[PDB]
Amino acid sequence: MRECISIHVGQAGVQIGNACWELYCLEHGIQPDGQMPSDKTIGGGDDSFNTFFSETGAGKHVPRAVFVDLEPTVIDEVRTGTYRQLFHPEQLITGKEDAANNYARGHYTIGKEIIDLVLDRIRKLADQCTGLQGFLVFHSFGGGTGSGFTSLLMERLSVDYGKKSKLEFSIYPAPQVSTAVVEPYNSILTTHTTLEHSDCAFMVDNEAIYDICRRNLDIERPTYTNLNRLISQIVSSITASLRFDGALNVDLTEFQTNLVPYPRIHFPLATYAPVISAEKAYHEQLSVAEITNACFEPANQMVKCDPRHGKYMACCLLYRGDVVPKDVNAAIATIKTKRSIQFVDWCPTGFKVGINYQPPTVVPGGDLAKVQRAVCMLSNTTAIAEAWARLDHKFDLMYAKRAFVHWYVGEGMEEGEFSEAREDMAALEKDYEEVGVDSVEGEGEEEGEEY
Amino acid sequence: MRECISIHVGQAGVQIGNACWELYCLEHGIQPDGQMPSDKTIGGGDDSFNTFFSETGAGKHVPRAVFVDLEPTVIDEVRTGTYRQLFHPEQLITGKEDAANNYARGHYTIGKEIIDLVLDRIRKLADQCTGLQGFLVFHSFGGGTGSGFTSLLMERLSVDYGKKSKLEFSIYPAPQVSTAVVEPYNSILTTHTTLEHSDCAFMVDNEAIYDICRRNLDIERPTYTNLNRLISQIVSSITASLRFDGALNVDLTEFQTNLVPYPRIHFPLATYAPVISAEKAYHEQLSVAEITNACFEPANQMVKCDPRHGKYMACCLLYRGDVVPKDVNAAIATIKTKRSIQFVDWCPTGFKVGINYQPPTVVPGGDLAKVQRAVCMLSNTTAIAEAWARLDHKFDLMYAKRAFVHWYVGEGMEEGEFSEAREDMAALEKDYEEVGVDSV
Amino acid sequence: MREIVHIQAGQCGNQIGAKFWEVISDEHGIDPTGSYHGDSDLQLERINVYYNEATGNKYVPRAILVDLEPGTMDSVRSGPFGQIFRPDNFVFGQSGAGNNWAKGHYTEGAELVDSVLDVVRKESESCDCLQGFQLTHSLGGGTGSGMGTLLISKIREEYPDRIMNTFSVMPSPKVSDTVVEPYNATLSVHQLVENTDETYCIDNEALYDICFRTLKLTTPTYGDLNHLVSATMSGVTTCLRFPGQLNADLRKLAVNMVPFPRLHFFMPGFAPLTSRGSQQYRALTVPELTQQMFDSKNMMAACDPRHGRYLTVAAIFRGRMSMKEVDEQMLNVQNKNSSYFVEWIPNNVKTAVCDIPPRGLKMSATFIGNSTAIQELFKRISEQFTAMFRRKAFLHWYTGEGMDEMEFTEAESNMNDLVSEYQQYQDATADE
Amino acid sequence: ASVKVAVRVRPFNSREMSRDSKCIIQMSGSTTTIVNPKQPKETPKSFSFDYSYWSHTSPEDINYASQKQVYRDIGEEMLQHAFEGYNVCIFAYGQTGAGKSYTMMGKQEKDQQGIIPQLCEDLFSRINDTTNDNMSYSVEVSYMEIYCERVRDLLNPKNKGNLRVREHPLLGPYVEDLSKLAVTSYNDIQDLMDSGNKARTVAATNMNETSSRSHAVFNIIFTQKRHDAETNITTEKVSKISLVDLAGSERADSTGAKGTRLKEGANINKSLTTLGKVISALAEMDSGPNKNKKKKKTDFILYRDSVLTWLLRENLGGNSRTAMVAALSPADINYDETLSTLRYADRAKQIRCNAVINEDPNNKLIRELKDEVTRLRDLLYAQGLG
Ligand SMILES: CC(=O)O[C@H]1C(=O)[C@@]2(C)[C@H]([C@H](OC(=O)c3ccccc3)[C@]3(O)C[C@H](OC(=O)[C@H](O)[C@@H](NC(=O)c4ccccc4)c4ccccc4)C(C)=C1C3(C)C)[C@]1(OC(C)=O)CO[C@@H]1C[C@@H]2O
Ligand SMILES: Nc1nc2c(ncn2[C@@H]2O[C@H](COP(=O)(O)OP(=O)(O)OP(=O)(O)O)[C@@H](O)[C@H]2O)c(=O)[nH]1
Ligand SMILES: Nc1nc2c(ncn2[C@@H]2O[C@H](COP(=O)(O)OP(=O)(O)OP(=O)(O)O)[C@@H](O)[C@H]2O)c(=O)[nH]1
Ligand SMILES: Nc1ncnc2c1ncn2[C@@H]1O[C@H](COP(=O)(O)OP(=O)(O)NP(=O)(O)O)[C@@H](O)[C@H]1O
Ligand SMILES: Nc1nc2c(ncn2[C@@H]2O[C@H](COP(=O)(O)OP(=O)(O)O)[C@@H](O)[C@H]2O)c(=O)[nH]1
Ligand SMILES: [Mg+2]
Ligand SMILES: [Mg+2]
Ligand SMILES: [Mg+2]
């Protein structure tokens, strides 16, 4: 009834997809083989929710997803793993070499010969849907595939469908740590297609999530599984309003209407307040006010950027569990009195509220405590520009001497499709500076005259 | 015979009619179902008096009345109440909404499409009559129906019948208390009806009757039922000379002859003297002098006017009970001896007297006490202009800014029709301030 | 007969409706299955105002449900009274307005309006003599504002004689649930000021304050707010359904309340509210009802009546009481507070009395006030509107659906004209 | 400048002859006197205006007012002001049977033409005579009716849909899709007129065989283009001429209205009452501050309660020179209604116009600065200081 296709590209996308689909199957009571014995025990119900799963005659449920990659190594783990019987066999792997941290190879030397099949499968999936809400693309900057093939796929999807919404959940390069040397080129070349075609893009950072895991959950040696679980919780909180019943429901288009002021500034940050270990789940009340306050703490941000250095253009709070609107109004009122949190003068309201009844689930073997109230906050702010500026510096230090450039031009790329991207990025960095300035004092010349 | 037709219009008229017909039925011995056991127990007499009741072959007595309203919510209470079998089934509701306190709706748009039925029923009722004397119209100013539809009906009746007397019993707006914001417009717009087509208009005020109930009857929280019962008593005292025997009888034409010196001044006041509770009915003689002095008290008037500020032009006293003419001739003298009561120069006589033997009856569950001597006074004086003048002031305060005017215009009335009416009203005031100017 | 058609649009209007039909059903005596199981004989005498008859002695509510999301329809059907309403009246679509006024008014609602109007025509044709309409919605959302004003315009075009009412839940000063409230509120008021006969201003903050300070509830929810709104809704129309000493149709209230056409925004109130544990201390009589009714903290619009002047006020009492006491109390509240009443209307209180009170109460009263202080509310929205229109904060979502800036400018101008009109009588002096 | 006021009396009609009546109105010069039939020889009233017109007695020329006389008196000055650059407007007024239409339309078939075709004749003759190599004119027309708070086009072919009214933020209210058509000759505009008058909605009443059920406005946009390609600019001046034929005030008991006619009369009366309130309030507003203190008290006038007042807001007050033509019935029967008209005519005289001639601001400033600089330079050069 309200369908959403999920597209996962690259190793990061596929692994986050594993975490997300584990969470969804645990949430709706579907076994890893697709059967749902809970419905048989109940004798009938709507548990086969159409937002993510499609039902066949025999009761088997198949997810609405499309996995893509160029290395067989990652998809082969899924094809012989615990969820081998859940997915359709069409996993869309390119049985060849990989892009190898090269944007050009991902875009238009190896991205071809696989894009057509992917688009055909997406066409079949969309035809099965009786009313679409949008797409959810999971990818990663820096990697060759997740940049180039993502750019090509978004271009083709925007041409073919056009009106439907398109959201992203991407891993931005961290300020200090990185697992590659040619990351900035890939990120800068990706920014154009991230800007023109996508409608609302969320960004996260591995360093921030590492710090959150260290400080809050008391895990000294985390791995990618915990980070993927946290991102899965974020996405589930985003999409919970389409599935379960609630007092105030927020559709996917409501996010876009209430969160982006102008078409070019659709880069909000995300946060999840009650991250706490089972041991520390006690000794604390975890009331609505506490989690709402924690959402605004600069230390809990999932991107290495300080909100105190900018201004909040807009915010959107999604609550889940035992919450009553009165406490939400009180929380927002007390937040509006603090002077550290700054709001641009042209958005006096600056808040969106959504409440859902289903509380979050617990994954067996996880590291998050069972709680009765949760909140996910999405903030459109001007601090994020700082992060971009840092990455931009790195790009220049490698492009002055034309390092690692022959690999890119050797795969059919002109040298001046580089500088071009930089200029585009610079223009974006201007707009975030322009919007955040307070309205000039008495913007309409001066007033006061005869009546 | 001596026969009258009663027309009740609007909620106030219908409720006053309920009280009035309860009183008449109790007076004559007619049960609520219309049967009179007194006929089968006595075998004679004329207790089926034709002044108010028409007799059928089976022995049932149907009243001579016409109830009218533009909503069903009020008259339906009669159709499913205690007196459902007394009245004829034809009660003339308009199967629509009400006039909404709007003169224009009640006179031009919604007031029509029911006038024809009302006229047909009145014609049928008057055809059965054999000496019809006059009409009694009960209504209330300030209501859309009671103003507009009453005006339309009065015009049609004057055109059709012409010579029959048409008395009026109306509820004038009070100076201070009120239950609608647009009362002055509706009250001023209907001066033409009461001034041109009516023959004698009696007015009362809710505040005056509230004060009388609070003081004389010791009722702290009265409601409309007591007011209706008192007005019913006054109407009965007016009409009693037609039905029962008496030493001096007064017909309706005699009332009109003695209370109306000139055509345009037919606006007398009415008072009823022995209003007293059962507990206070003792400790007092309630003789003729006491009751006839009670009529002249400013505090016992039924409209908030002070008779001391004007001059008495005519007076008519109607006694019911054990009263002998001697005691009546002696009081008329004492009140002529007193100097606080002023009579105009051109009326050397001043007083008309009538006496009837039938004493007033008591309604079960009522508040008036049983008494052996009663008197109803009707007095034509110049003080009534005061009650008019205040209202005119109110009208001005709303007409300078044209407040609440588009409702009237949207229903077919023209703006100038307001102003014209006001001038007419002013002229009326001017003539009651130049019939007293002492003659020179 | 005086028959009313009810329409509900959006989540807020739909839920308020639900609780209105649970307060009007008990008062007449209707089972959830539609059968009648009452006691008194006056409950069926005027049932046809809000209910149509069906062959099995059944009574179906004469209502119409509208939305652009199936979820709210499903919630109402899966409820205690979901089976009482006619299935054919559940008009809805998919791909809701998305909190966008343009989508509700121009793009998405333009398709569903034809079906809703067909249902409205069918329902109105079956009536014997139609009195008027009434519609419940919230001005802060897309579906409510858009389709409500569109339907109001269409119906007023087709049925010009009949009276039209609205019960609007309007943006709160501090409380905010959506970011683009000012645009929707301005664009909806631009139509409401033109195409309606009465409007009642509801605000969430006032209801929360009443629940806290007067009813002493610890955890209010939307059900209590719907409860209060439903109580006022029933009290307004009580005089059409039960007998009394003084009667007041909706048209009579409109005539007595609206001095000029562009002043039909009202402040509602109800009495008594006692907090379930202090009734044993509080007496019940007409003076205390008037005292609670004219108090400033009782009003449901979050506008202080002491900051302006009462143009005109109306009181509908329900119970068995004396008329002298009522008249004396209204005169007293006039005379003591003469500074707050306009001088060029000699008497500006309308009074009505009905005999049958609510089921569990011995007396009750409802209040409809018309005062200048409401202008304050509009000013707030206007200020906020400017703060987002000076820079085109969220404009491309609207212009993308077939709109232009001229509409925004004229919508602002009309509200400013209304505020100036209300202000003209506010200040003292004026006089003759 | 004040709003000019003209008053004109028509002769008796058959309705006033079958039921006997007498002539109550007199006039001398610009003053008109009203006698009271109900209270005669008590208080005869007099009122002073800009023009009074006695068209009662056609056979005699003693102070007789023909159509050409009234036209030469007001329409010629309005057209001259329009040629200067002003926007001008003269609108009728009166009660059902006052002859408001006979004054603004007249009879084309006779020489006794109204004040709409004679302007058109004078305008077309003037532009045809004054046209040159360096002088050209562009003239366009529109005509709209207000039936019951809905605007309908008469020039357009059959278009059932009603027209929406918008508010340009700079230019004020206007109608959207009003069929504005250009004209080049008398015959073209005359045919447009015949179509428009045939399209107007009319009905028969007991007060008038052919009465009007709608207000009607005639707008002419006139463009003066001076074409000196070396020096001057084209489209030098733009002006608006508008004439209004309001519907007559209905009385109901003396018209026989019923059903649909009564509803139309109610709507007409509401519109006229709103217009009267606007007139009185505007006169008060312009009278008070002008003489009281000049404080500019912020009592604002309200035109939003009727589409008629909204459309004519500029003409009622602001950038327009405006005048009134009150038609009157002489019979005693209408003595009240006639009197009201006279009073409202008086309230029109106190109203003030605030009208200016303007062009593109850059052109005006450049021309004025050039003139000043030329004068200063000439003075300097004449004295040898340049
Ligand atoms: C012991 C006693 O006196 O019980 C009362 C009571 O305590 C009070 C507190 C009731 C109670 O109301 C509340 O507590 C309440 C809470 C939130 C929102 C609204 C009300 C009562 O629930 C409400 C209930 O009202 C009714 O029974 C009316 O018929 C009422 N019914 C409903 O609204 C209704 C709701 C759901 C289902 C069916 C009916 C009504 C009022 C106006 C118009 C129509 C109907 C009454 C008298 C009481 C209780 C039960 C405690 C009061 O409610 C009203 C509005 O009448 C609170 O103000 C009054 C004062 C009463 O004294
Ligand atoms: N949060 C998170 N980030 C990941 C994960 N896996 C990879 N990444 C990030 O992704 C970056 C590498 O890009 P990928 O898209 O995974 O590379 P790829 O998919 O193999 O495509 P190629 O570059 O062509 O090899 C690394 O720098 C990581 O920071 C993961 O499981 N979780
Ligand atoms: N004395 C007395 N006066 C009453 C009574 N009922 C109503 N009134 C008066 O009637 C006035 C209101 O006008 P109504 O007569 O009720 O209006 P209506 O006749 O119902 O006509 P509509 O307004 O169209 O319904 C009030 O000022 C009351 O004083 C009553 O029972 N007794
Ligand atoms: N001064 C006049 N000389 C000759 N004929 C006249 C004169 N005044 C009116 N008439 C005729 O009598 C009729 C009444 O005039 P008319 O202009 O129609 O009234 P009006 O003011 O337009 N009111 P309405 O009838 O509602 O439009 C017209 O048809 C004229 O032909
Ligand atoms: N009183 C009341 N208000 C509500 C309720 N639900 C939502 N609202 C209000 O409605 C506003 C949102 O409007 P919405 O229902 O989304 O409008 P729609 O999207 O067009 O249907 C918020 O400001 C809420 O305060 C409710 O149950 N009761
Ligand atoms: Mg790879
Ligand atoms: Mg009534
Ligand atoms: Mg005409």
Author numbering:
A (entry chain E): 1 to 451
B (entry chain A): 1 to 440
C (entry chain B): 1 to 432
D (entry chain K): 4 to 389
Quote from the publication.
KIF1A, a key member of the kinesin-3 family, is recognized for its high processivity and fast MT plus-end-directed motility. These attributes are crucial for the long-distance transport of cargoes in neurons. Mutations in the microtubule-associated motor protein KIF1A lead to severe neurological conditions known as KIF1A-associated neurological disorders (KAND). Here, we present 2.7-3.5 Å resolution structures of dimeric microtubule-bound KIF1A, including the pathogenic P305L mutant, across various nucleotide states.
To advance structure-based drug development, we determined high-resolution structures of KIF1A harboring the KAND-associated P305L mutation in complex with MTs, using the same nucleotide conditions as those for MT-bound WT KIF1A. The KIF1A-P305L mutant, like its WT counterpart, exhibits classes with both one- and two-heads-bound configurations in the presence of AMP-PNP: the leading head in an open conformation and the trailing head in a closed conformation with nucleotide bound to both heads (MT-KIF1AP305L-ANP-TL1). Weak densities corresponding to α- and/or β-tubulin tails connecting to the motor domain were detected in all nucleotide states, suggesting that the P305L mutation does not prevent interactions between the K-loop and the α and β-tubulin tails. A notable divergence in the P305L mutant is the reorientation of F303 due to clash with the introduced leucine residue. On the other hand, the five best AF2 models of WT KIF1A more closely resemble the MT-bound structures in this area. These predictions, along with the conformational changes observed in the MT-bound structures, indicate that the P305L mutation induces loop-12 conformations that are suboptimal for MT binding, thereby shifting the equilibrium towards the MT-unbound (or weakly-bound) states, as observed here.
